[PDB]
Amino acid sequence: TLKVEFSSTVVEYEYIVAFNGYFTAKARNSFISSALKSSEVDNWRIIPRNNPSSDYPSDFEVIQIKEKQKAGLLTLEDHPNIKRVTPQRKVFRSLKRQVAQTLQADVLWQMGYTGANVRVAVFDTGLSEKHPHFKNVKERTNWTNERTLDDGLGHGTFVAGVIASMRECQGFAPDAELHIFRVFTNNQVSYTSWFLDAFNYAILKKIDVLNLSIGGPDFMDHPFVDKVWELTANNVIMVSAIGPADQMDVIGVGGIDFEDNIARFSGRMKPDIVTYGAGVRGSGVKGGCRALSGTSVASPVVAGAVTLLVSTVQKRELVNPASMKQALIASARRLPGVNMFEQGHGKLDLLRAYQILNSYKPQASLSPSYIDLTECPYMWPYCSQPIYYGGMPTVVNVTILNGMGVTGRIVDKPDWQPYLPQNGDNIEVAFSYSSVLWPWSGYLAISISVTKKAASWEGIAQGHVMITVASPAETGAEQTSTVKLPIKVKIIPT
Ligand SMILES: *[C@@H]1O[C@H](CO)[C@@H](O)[C@H](O)[C@H]1NC(C)=O
């Protein structure tokens, strides 16, 4: 029903000038003008910005250069304060049941959890001023060149309705504090500078949950991805569709239907989880209800679910991107017969997600939480064949989720411990892994190879890895959480 493609381009002569910090407008201008005094390039100008972030010191600047760009950007990059210069990009988002009760958000509503005092933000095409399905819109800041805060196609209205609503289409969280970020034009066009200014204002606003519908391989570039990491690092639980989502720090979301099938519009394992994204209903542009089926649809489903889950939690101190991701995956109900690269840890379960989140203790975790190369079809393609000595190492890139801190570290070299009675000693596994873990997460890549004594052997070798993640005290002593990763493999003669 609804298809979300993308395309991007670079706009000639315009550059994002990322700074080594957060500067006032004149400081940015003076750094750039000195760096262009050392240089021989004269034909340059700052292309200034009019929006709610213009009233704030910034960590970037948009400039034009037409005469000689290589010398200009090389000289600017060589400026001390100027971290990086990257071209401006132009993206084009091609848009082509009581679900909260079908997930039993009634039971949470019944307890008195509705989304109160949770700032969720929609990075979409806006929300009309006089929509009756909402009660707590706080602001409708704009970031486009179009002079409208309202929604001209609805997608933003549909997303906001699913997250929050009180009418013929019920939203997951009625009492959420809504923040509308019109980052797309009524033609679905945006710019990296628009997104960067909007992300900066989202950081200033301190928005707990962000539903993000921006993708494309080129557009998620160095300033973009860095700003995403900085939001997640500022405790911005981000939710996006896989179609940022496929990054380490964002809750990626896939889409099933109401019969728990994988829909026809549906490395490390992503999505994290799935939920309903076919036949879902949400608010109309001025009013009414409408149903949409597509990949983008489950993302607001999970975003609403997360907003409600955040309201569920007594002490908000414990809610971060990693702990929320951990709950979505631990509570997840596995779909029988779906591999890990379509469903992640299992379709969303709002009530058991609420249960884990209610009992959750700060700790590190792995995704996948175990290795079993003989578990077809979940662990596919690793079960397409067993590991035979003389073959390339089996490499599994494991996400670490450090719910103990935005910064943490592997304390030492992760230890592979084979079971002797189960002849785990017939494999060796090496670790090539990111050392420091930021933000809220890291990675651990494991390269499994059979040993020499079992070149002519057939059977199941087993063992575990004993990793340890440390991160400073967030409450002192480091916060340490050792995590066993069971490993099970079937070996054969070469
Ligand atoms: C694991 O994933 C990360 C992505 O964050 C990547 O940079 C790294 O190279 C991967 N490791 C291996 C061994 O592929």
Residue numbers in the entry: 42 to 137, 191 to 337, 349 to 371, 385 to 593, 598 to 616
From the paper:
We therefore obtained a cryo-EM structure of the S1Pecto purified without co-expressed SPRINGecto. The N- and C-termini of the A-domain run along the side of the Peptidase S8 subdomain. This structure is from a WT S1Pecto sample that has undergone autocatalysis and therefore the density sharply disappears after K137, which corresponds to cleavage at the S1P B-site motif. The P6 Val also makes hydrophobic contacts and the P4 Arg is inserted deeply into an acidic pocket where it makes a salt bridge with D218 of the catalytic triad as well as Q282 and S307. Unlike SPRINGecto, the A-domain of S1Pecto appears to interact only with the Peptidase S8 subdomain. Consequently, this S1Pecto is essentially inactive in protease assays based on the S1P cleavage motif from SREBP2.
SPRING activates S1P by dislodging its inhibitory pro-domain and stabilizing intra-domain contacts.
